[model samples]
Target: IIGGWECEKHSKPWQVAVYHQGHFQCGGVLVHPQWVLTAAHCMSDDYQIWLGRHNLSKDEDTAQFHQVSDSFLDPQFDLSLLKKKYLRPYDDISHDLMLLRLAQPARITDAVKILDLPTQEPKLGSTCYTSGWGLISTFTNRGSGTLQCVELRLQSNEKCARAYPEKMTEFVLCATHRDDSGSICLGDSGGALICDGVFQGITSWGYSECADFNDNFVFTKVMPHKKWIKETIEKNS
Candidate 1:
């Protein structure tokens, strides 16, 4: 998270660290005791979820770990939309959401809780925040040991279309660092975009350069998939 600062310990109780093959791969948010929300692209055969974690450098006693029992990917996700270019069209990046069912229900505590999904669409230009343990610098590609957060302004579909030059669908939402100083980079994918205390978007894609004022960070709009998410969780449970 370029130009971001360390988050207050345990402030984001719903935040989780997603691991693939014993390595930190991406971020996730706990939406239910037994379910997690993340990006489909972060999916892998082997997975683990760490909850209530503060510092990755230390094994905090408050941390609760769980193994993933199953994963559900969005049916609308299309890999073909991605083009062979550094700046792929946004159409290729829609519906990138995924949900994971935990083998055991997480123990909710002061430092561990579930985040509520947004009921209404986020207003354009409204302030929102995203947090993760993603890379702090593109040059070093170093992931943060502690969670970091940055404030961003939600962008309109028209504004994003102007930058991405593709069909902007309701399934996608865009946000940008107002000052071009902070950005969600590698290892941040699947993190939660929080607006008005609700989950609005799931970190999906962005430019290779991390933060650029001209370009916006893309996310999978959570509202459009609310029905799918509910049904999947009910059936899986």
Candidate 2:
């Protein structure tokens, strides 16, 4: 199941698992035929997936349901020891990334192209896109079914150092919003962050409080972990 790259941009739709008996969770992306990269913490026992879907305004009865063939999350990450030197995981914005295999392939377009992996170590203020079926307005608890996204530029290393000094590391890249178009809220977990049309990150966690000024969704960088991703795909597929 593939397409011309992003199911025609910002529409590379997928699903977020709903853990509760009834409710929508977050949305993700279909990185490969068998594998999906998502946030690890997004997992739950009662996960439900919505496929071939674009807008959340529609009902699940209208959506094709898909099963997760394989799921991979980064190991539990703690920066306690590494905090001293100001260096962090080489996999910038990693740990936040995860992978999923489809029970079977689903169809997509080539316009929805695959996001390339980050070939080199990431620096501050790089650009990317975070997409998902999330609330159009970050202030809303009531979310939307349609996939919405925000384009993010990596934060300056200095600014990141000042803002999230504790969690910020070499492994982390920060995204900011000069435009209203790209922001993910509740239900946008695991969605892809496409950079130059290739997947760069996935929705991990936002600022814990969801405050007014500071809001950034965590992403697990996929570029640096190409070998690991390939191994996982090869093994799982």
Candidate 3:
């Protein structure tokens, strides 16, 4: 969330911080009482989800901590490309989604809720918002203690393809800061991309330069994976 401002406390109740061994891992969205969605790259051997969290430095009363009982990483996520020395943007990041089954269903409260999955892709140039506790700047390489958010405008696949070349695909979507004031950075992966009040995308990858507006931030479009998401949850439950 580089160059973003602190979000109002509890304003994004679906936002959650995924942690492993007490270290912040990636941002996640609660799509169901017992399910959490995130990027496959953020997968860990063990996971702890902190729901209803705003400030990371303190344990807020609204926070509900739960350990992950199981996880389902998108089978399409390409590990070989991700492991390559030099990776092409979209090709390396396609199908970058994962789901975590909570050890117990999260207690719904004013500060905790679930986000509905998107039924369709966001329209080009539409307004969207993404929030996370990811790094506020590349200089510090440190994450924000408080949740931060920035507004973005959805970009067409053609535009994104022109910027990243032929790798862009239907499975991926792109967005840029509406005012070119901010972009998702380190540790932001797996955060929700909200469009028209629905969960639209999962933060995937972007230019290493946090403020590079020339390149659109890439996301794993959620609509295409909705069936898989539902099927996985059903089988696991």
Candidate 4:
């Protein structure tokens, strides 16, 4: 019930989905009314996705809307990019992203922003917000019933370079804000990296050192990927 009006489940423009652990795992911002962007790793054979939802604790609440869906995995996706380089039981289905299609079109409004993009560089030392429903602690599997919000600080290239070096693609940026809660946890990946009312990136990965107030969250840059994203949305729609 956004602003007292009942909106469709994840139907509001910009509400994509992140699926994992046998449920409609998480949500992403809506960039297109019909085309939604999210992480590919979230894809699975199961096809239930919820949108226009804020609280996930209640399965049948009025705001809890759902859609039957399909997923598009990037053909050029390097599945290994999503694997824990040194961890066993590697998540073979790893690539940091995928997309969910909304069955019906959604209304766009203040409560349903078709995600605004950042026109300028997010810049070093900048402040941003990462939202999700992942565990409060990275090592835990406990997910919040309600979505969580974390504030993060942008890490400069030089600093990010210290951890990612040349590995950090220009299309990606890392954030290490000053708060212990500035992170998008387990179910949070593939969602929006919003700042100043614009969609800047998609939260994809994080490290304990980075997310633990170290700002190690990795995100897909929306600007560099704009052409691909726009083209995909058009193609999918």
Candidate 5:
């Protein structure tokens, strides 16, 4: 799995695969029966989301798929200032997040249900986790078709500030692997960060050198935008 342990199906039913042209590109979280959350950077006009996905190629009856009806980007996630001034390889991962409206509601089941949204930011050094079908080793260019998870020890924003100085904001959360576990890599983008069984963050971006044991990665903090999420769902649905 993607630099971590394999995840069981029902353990992360909210986890969904974002596919473009029948190829998995990123991960998404089912926030509501008809809404999904993911990274804004992964947005596309044509999209198909697969929920309750275990094997990439296998078609299990538990899995559900749907076309995207619409999408929205966080209005505050503007990166025009950074690109106009710094002219760096800036992805504005600071507010790197998005929401998708599914064409139809998903069939709620033991393997397909919405994850609770957190009302407050997670305490520093708390136990958290993330899962996706990304890379298991940064050294390789291949991705695991199976979902993989990383148990992380939450870190203060200071830990990732080094990589995103002048851009890191309070809306972001930082974390590092608890053990000598692997780092989050490609195909993991847009994945959900789990804390106490609640949806807490979305996989944003990481350091230039990946898979390092001590380096931290950034995530889009969800608690701060809980209201926006609810409002968007109401307006869309």
Candidate 6:
């Protein structure tokens, strides 16, 4: 986002760069051999999940790719409240998460491995990290070319509620670089928020400017959906 550093080659083994028609579209995490955890909004079309690479503009030996075999979006994605009467124009997206089954399993290596899922709720204000290939700004198509990462702190529900108001729910968690400038922007959707070596959340949405300096990045909490993820994998397998 605003201020971040480029990652080294295959530094984050579980990180994935999802592409649509040869263009980078979003980020994902390798949770299983043939399964990828990403945002539901990122699953509209077939995607090529690139693994073990830090740069997007070049072909490298460390890079491996897989085709999406199928996707499972959460059934409880609705965020509107009050039944059918209070539907607001800006409906906040909830349950904005999904799982993508890869056509083939990735070869496990030092530079390519699955990430461990969280088993408990992450404490508020804890230190965490998020990475992706999203651009520095939302006004242009400019990208980092290489993978970018930044340290961020888990925010309280109160802080997150400010961004979504009554729209914020328990399913979503918030994170932001305290400097108030860094945040996950467009194309960072489905990126992982790693806390203490555990996969904790997935990037879902944020302000359009991405440099709001006031908005916190919203993410789908992984622990709450662990059961669904396990069931989806078992059913598909």
Q: Per-model C-alpha lDDT, please?
A: 0.76, 0.51, 0.76, 0.55, 0.72, 0.73
Backbone collision count in every prediction? Answer: 1, 36, 0, 16, 1, 0
lDDT of 6: 0.73
Winner by TM-score between candidate 3 and candidate 2: 3
Error of 3 at 34 (Å): 1.0
Ranking by TM-score: 3, 1, 6, 5, 4, 2
**Candidate 4 per-residue lDDT over residues 117-235, each given as its tens digit:** 56777766667766666554545442445555556666764554453354456666666655443434545666677655567778664332223435343577777766666677778
Q: What are the runs in model 2 whose C-alpha is more than 4 Å off?
A: 1-10, 13-22, 60-62, 76-94, 109-127, 136-142, 179-183, 206-208, 211-217
lDDT of 5 by residue, 38-103 (tens): 877666669978998887867787889898899888887664532331112334565667889999
TM-score of each: 0.88, 0.69, 0.89, 0.73, 0.86, 0.87
TM-score of 1: 0.88
Q: How would you encode candidate 1's per-residue C-alpha lDDT over 26-102 as one tens digit per residue?
A: 78889999999887767678997899988888889989999999988888776543342233434355677789999
lDDT of 6 by residue, 1-237 (tens): 557888776778998888777766678889999899887666656787888978788887888989888888888766333133222324454677789999989999888999888877798778888888878554455244888888877877566566447656767677766666676666777778887666788876533445332354367788888899999999995
Give the better candidate number (4 or 5) by TM-score.
Answer: 5
Cα deviation at 7, candidate 5, in Å, is 0.9
Once fitted onto the true fold, the runs of candidate 3 whose alpha carbons sit more than 4 angstroms away are: 81-91, 136-142, 206-214
Better structure of 5 and 6 per lDDT: 6
The predicted structure with the larger TM-score, 1 or 4, is 1
Q: Record all residue pairs in model 6 with backbone atoms less than 3 Å apart, i.e. clashing.
A: none
Any residue pairs clashing in model 1, and if so which? Answer: 81-92
* Candidate 3 global TM-score: 0.89
Better of 3 and 5 by TM-score: 3
Write one digit per residue (lDDT tens) for candidate 2, span 1-237: 000112332255443333234455556666565666665545555555555555556554435555775677655444342233222222234465567677876555432324445566555566766655544343443245455545567665344344445656545445666643334454565666665555555665532222111233255555656777788878778
